[PDB]
Design a protein around this nucleic acid. Structure first.
Ligand SMILES: [Mg+2]
Ligand SMILES: [Mg+2]
Ligand SMILES: [Mg+2]
Ligand SMILES: [Mg+2]
Ligand SMILES: [Mg+2]
Ligand SMILES: [Mg+2]
Ligand SMILES: [Mg+2]
Ligand SMILES: [Mg+2]
Ligand SMILES: [Mg+2]
Ligand SMILES: [Mg+2]
Ligand SMILES: [Mg+2]
Ligand SMILES: [Mg+2]
Ligand SMILES: [Mg+2]
Ligand SMILES: [Mg+2]
Ligand SMILES: [Mg+2]
Ligand SMILES: [Mg+2]
Lengths: 205, 123, 80, 82, 129, 156, 151
RNA sequence: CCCGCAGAAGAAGCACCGGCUAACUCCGUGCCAGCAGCCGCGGUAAUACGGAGGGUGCAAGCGUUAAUCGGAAUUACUGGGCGUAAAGCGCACGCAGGCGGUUUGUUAAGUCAGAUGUGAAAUCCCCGGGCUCAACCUGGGAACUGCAUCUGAUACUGGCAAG
RNA sequence: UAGCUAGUAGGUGGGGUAACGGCUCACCUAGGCGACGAUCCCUAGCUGGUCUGAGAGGAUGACCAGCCACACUGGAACUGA
């Protein structure tokens, strides 16, 4: 239950960066990021609003790796909460344990980070956890189990994290490879390319 | 249609006459073809429609379109039927299932074979 | 304080008992229009002392017949 | 008779006991009269697994209710818990 | 047979404001006065006045703001053919509280707002807007 | 800084002595995203012309609705040419839940959170014929206060 | 009567005969739908697919030599469990099975009965109805079907 | 449940790509057929049949059928109609029934307000807690729009009386 | 599917029952029910709820809980709280 094809094809389909590779190189260096995949992938089709909605949904899924059925659960729960639904949807999407680890730069790509979680390498609040979809709470302190604190991948990813913008709501300490989910990240704390309102619109069909 | 007329006569609603009566909510039914025959349409349209008269376990005799590309059926051939209505057929509200119960597994199909029971060919 | 109803007899053709018809004004379930509903009864007319139409007052009691379960308690108008 | 006993709830291999009062003739998870607390055998100090309204109980056994030996022990605990 | 005076009174305003009359009048009644008074102070008209004794008539000075009638939509809800009553909490809101629902309570007749101030259900007579 | 969106294009006939002569009718709306919007509809011999001219008329006719915060101020319906359209403000972040034709209208105007629903026939020109009217018929919490000669809280 | 069913019989018989197949009943219905139904008899068996083969060939000879000018509809059929018997020979082949028949005349005492064949003659078919070995002239029978019962 | 071991090592499929509806070409294909939820499709080329490549969706599942509600304001209480589309009885009288001008008093039935009882638990919902997460289980609450009773309120509707 | 009912409706008395009662019986009265649908006919275990629906509603009563009913068919009782 996880997509395992090539990565860039998605970005080339969704026509943007998705941080699907470690980032040591630029995307165009590795693909035709400007142009969709496939034989007809060169031509620019005349899509629809519905097409827009779907294409934005598949984006936020793919950028996070949630399959379909597990996703709308997030939504169907996100709508149940208070505040702007589509807003807090991303908020809890920002709560997936792996993503936090990835945000904490222990893993270059989320999948790499996900493999760590799945491979029993991370303890939230001292106790081990290995479900990637494990939601996290404020003040939680993830960490690296010593059986992996010497892994070559974790140090290299930490050396790649500062090449990207240091997240605010969560604070890390790369010295001993453990950080703190201080605050629930806000909408502005995320990017702006995401159109959460149409993501709601889609499921509200 | 004033309220005082509703209290003396509440609004009714006609029932949903099942377009698939011979199924009685059964998603499928087993049946035996009591006749096999094909029918061509009028002069302008030239085509062949495969269809069998089949008596069901419930006792009904109906018409079910033969899925096509598998035709091994004749009198006293049992067969499982499902409710599907094809345009251009007046009384055919049922489609014979293809891939079970005395229906030939159609010749190799690389596409949409599950809708014909063809198993994944192991190269 | 005892409970009681205040109906109106419609018949007394039977020995020492009467047929009181209550009248309850109820709002329709769905259509919202208020309506008046009656609940006939079989009240034990002790002494056989009520005419027709004369509005009465009754009270529930242990069974006294196959039908009756109600005792008259007074008359509030005697059938002008 | 009228007894105080344990109805089983929770899930497979994770049982949870609602201590209730009921006519003994009724099924273990059938109807009852007055649920008067709960029991959790697998609390493990994560949460309380013994809350009793023993005065309501006292009121019941006061008027002739009898006690399942399990809850009889449970009652002994909260008293020792004090 | 005029089996409702209030609806008539209202239409006399709707068909009044529409016909762009300066003023309209009705055979008065202690109720209609109370109906007028509340909406009167509620700015939906300028003033009313009643005269005559054996057949007192009520007379209303309609309103127009900018070549447009102030009141523009009127509807009697609780009608003789079907009454309507609402409890305190379910007191409706007209145009998200921009409109006004005139309701009678045991404590008289007032706007819906005043009702849920006193916390009194009652009979919803008209929606005004 | 405007914003436009085509709605529907139909190929209409016109029977002449010899055969017919098709044409193309476009239909579009234009809004400023700030509660000010108009619509246009114009025939032509071929699509881009129609889409062009109809687009231009809509640059006139742009009424100015007094919405508040990407949402309406009160529920409102509007009926025109056999089409009925109910709308009402929605909670924050609810979105634009509306049938196809209306969605653009609501979008370009500046609305963000609104429930909606059509009724009767769903001919696109009719519903926009039936929507903008409904929109302008909104009333600010002071348009009343003014026309009712009161202060804002005096109504609120 | 016979809508020149004679020619219909020859026109269908030729290709059918060419198929090594035997022809049994030809029926045409006009008005409700100008559809013709054909009953065929293959000893090995009759799949729909073969019915298609003959439907195509018969359609071909039908197309050129058709002067009836009715709507061009016709179905190919293989005998049902309830199969019509038209020849005296057909009655002969089904020696001892139930056959229902209706008299052309709608006068009272019409032979709307079914029986079991006891003997078969040309003009006269013996079928047992009400314990009586009746004899029927097939020409005076509007329509008849055999063994509608499924065993 | 933990620890150790070895090795990427033992583990991906099913529909669909004319429109609705996200996703396209090649080759046959010959209206032969076949495709079909509908509209429709097929010729010498078919993005709609078959194969191929490519693509979209979903995933240990994926499709088909069945069944129910929805969409359907398509029984329209909320929330439809009846000149010509279906729909005003041929007309009238009239019982039952429905509805009723205006003022005062009275009543408190309707109505409203409040209280009280009850409305099993589970379920649904909110705030928690516990299984590593989740499903699941669980605390507490909310709610169960109801019903009954009592005490009020009198504008409204009803009753009574007097106009 | 428009009338339905003679233990039917009521009373008196006796019997009967753990208990009230046409429960039963005698006796007397001649009623009782129905368009606010009696009677008849078809269908069906009921509810908490469940699915759907924005809502009102529509559907439904598998699992779990409450209640009822039945135990080859029909009838009868005995014992016993
Ligand atoms: Mg799964
Ligand atoms: Mg598309
Ligand atoms: Mg409906
Ligand atoms: Mg209509
Ligand atoms: Mg007429
Ligand atoms: Mg008259
Ligand atoms: Mg009256
Ligand atoms: Mg009056
Ligand atoms: Mg409950
Ligand atoms: Mg937790
Ligand atoms: Mg009065
Ligand atoms: Mg006695
Ligand atoms: Mg005695
Ligand atoms: Mg609805
Ligand atoms: Mg069961
Ligand atoms: Mg005994």
């Amino acid at each position: 239950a996880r997509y395992l094809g090539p990565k860039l094809k998605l970005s080339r389909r969704e026509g943007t960066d998705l941080f699907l590779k470690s980032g040591v190189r630029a995307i165009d260096t590795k693909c035709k990021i400007e142009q969709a995949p496939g034989q007809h992938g060169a031509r620019k089709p005349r899509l629809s609003d519905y097409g827009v909605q779907l294409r934005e949904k598949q984006k936020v899924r793919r950028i996070y790796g949630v399959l379909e059925r597990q996703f709308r659960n997030y939504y169907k729960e996100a709508a149940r909460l208070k505040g702007n639904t589509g807003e807090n949807l991303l908020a809890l999407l920002e709560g997936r344990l792996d993503n936090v680890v990835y945000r904490m730069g222990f893993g270059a790509t989320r999948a790499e980070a996900r493999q760590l979680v799945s491979h029993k390498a991370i303890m939230v609040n001292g106790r081990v956890v290995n479900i990637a979809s494990y939601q996290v709470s404020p003040n939680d302190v993830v960490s690296i189990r010593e059986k992996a604190k010497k892994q070559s991948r974790v140090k290299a990813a930490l050396e790649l994290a500062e090449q990207r913008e240091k997240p605010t709501w969560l604070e890390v300490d790369a010295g001993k490879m453990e950080g703190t989910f201080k605050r629930k990240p806000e909408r502005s704390d995320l990017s702006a390319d995401i159109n959460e309102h149409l993501i709601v619109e889609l499921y509200s069909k | 249609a004033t309220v005082n007329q509703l209290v003396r006569k509440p609004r009714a609603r006609k029932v949903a006459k099942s377009n698939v009566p011979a199924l009685e909510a059964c998603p499928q039914k087993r049946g035996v073809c009591t006749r096999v025959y094909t029918t061509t349409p009028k002069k302008p349209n030239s085509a062949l429609r495969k269809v069998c008269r089949v008596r069901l376990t419930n006792g009904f005799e109906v018409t079910s379109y033969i899925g096509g590309e598998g035709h091994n059926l004749q009198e006293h051939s049992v067969i499982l039927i499902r409710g599907g209505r094809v345009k251009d057929l007046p009384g055919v509200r049922y489609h014979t299932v293809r891939g079970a119960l005395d229906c030939s597994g159609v010749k190799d199909r690389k596409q949409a074979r599950s809708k014909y029971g063809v198993k994944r060919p192991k190269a | 304080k005892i409970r009681t109803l205040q109906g109106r007899v419609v018949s007394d053709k039977m020995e020492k008992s009467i047929v009181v018809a209550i009248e309850r004004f109820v709002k329709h379930p769905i259509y919202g229009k208020f309506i008046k509903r009656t609940t006939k009864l079989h009240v034990h007319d002790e002494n056989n002392e009520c005419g027709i139409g004369d509005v009465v007052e009754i009270r529930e009691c242990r069974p006294l017949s196959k039908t009756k379960s109600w005792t008259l308690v007074r008359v509030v108008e005697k059938a002008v | 008779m009228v007894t105080i006993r344990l109805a089983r709830h929770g899930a497979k291999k994770r049982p949870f006991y609602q201590v209730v009062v009921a006519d003994s003739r009724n099924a273990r998870n059938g109807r009852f009269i007055e649920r008067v607390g709960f029991f959790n055998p697998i609390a493990s100090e994560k949460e309380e697994g013994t809350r009793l309204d023993l005065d309501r109980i006292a009121h019941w056994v006061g008027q002739g209710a009898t006690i399942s030996d399990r809850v009889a022990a449970l009652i002994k605990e909260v008293n020792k818990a004090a | 047979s005029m089996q409702d005076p209030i609806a008539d009174m209202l239409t006399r305003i709707r068909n009044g404001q529409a016909a762009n009359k300066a003023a309209v009048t009705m055979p008065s009644s202690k109720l209609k006065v109370a109906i007028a008074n509340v909406l009167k102070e509620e700015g939906f008209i300028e003033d009313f006045k009643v005269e005559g004794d054996t057949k007192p008539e009520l007379e209303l000075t309609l309103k127009y703001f900018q070549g447009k009638a102030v009141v523009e939509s009127i509807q009697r809800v609780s009608r003789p053919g079907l009454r309507i009553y609402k409890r305190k909490d379910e007191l409706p809101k007209v145009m998200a509280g921009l409109g006004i629902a005139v309701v009678s309570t045991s404590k008289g007749v007032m706007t819906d707002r005043a009702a849920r101030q006193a916390g009194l259900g009652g009979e919803i007579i008209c929606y005004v807007a | 800084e405007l914003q436009e969106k085509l709605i529907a294009v139909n190929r209409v006939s016109k029977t002449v002595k010899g055969g017919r002569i098709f044409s193309f009718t476009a239909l579009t709306v234009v809004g400023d995203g700030n509660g000010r919007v108009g619509f246009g509809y114009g025939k032509a011999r071929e699509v881009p012309a129609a889409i062009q001219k109809a687009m231009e008329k809509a640059r006139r006719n742009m009424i100015n609705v007094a919405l508040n915060n990407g949402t309406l101020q009160h529920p409102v319906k509007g009926v025109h040419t056999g089409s009925r359209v109910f709308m009402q403000p929605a909670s924050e972040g609810t979105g634009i839940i509306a049938g196809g034709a209306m969605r653009a209208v609501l979008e370009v105007a500046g609305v963000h959170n609104v429930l909606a629903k059509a009724y009767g026939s769903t001919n696109p020109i009719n519903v926009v014929r039936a929507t903008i009217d409904g929109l302008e018929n909104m009333n600010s919490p002071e348009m009343v206060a003014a026309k009712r000669g009161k202060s804002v809280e005096e109504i609120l | 009567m016979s809508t020149l069913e004679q020619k219909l019989t020859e026109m269908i018989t030729a290709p059918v005969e060419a198929l090594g197949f035997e022809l049994v009943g030809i029926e045409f219905i006009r008005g409700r739908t100008s559809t013709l139904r054909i009953y065929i008899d293959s000893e090995d068996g009759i799949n729909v697919d073969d019915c298609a083969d003959v439907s195509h060939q018969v359609s071909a000879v039908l197309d050129v030599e058709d002067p009836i000018t009715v709507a061009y509809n016709l179905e190919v059929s293989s005998p049902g469990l309830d199969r019509p018997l038209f020849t005296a020979e057909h009655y002969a082949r089904f020696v001892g099975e139930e056959v229902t028949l209706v008299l052309r005349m709608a006068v009272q005492n019409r032979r709307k009965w079914q029986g079991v064949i006891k003997a078969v003659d040309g003009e006269m078919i013996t079928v047992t109805v009400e314990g009586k070995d009746e004899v029927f002239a097939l020409s005076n029978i509007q329509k008849a079907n055999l063994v509608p019962h499924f065993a």
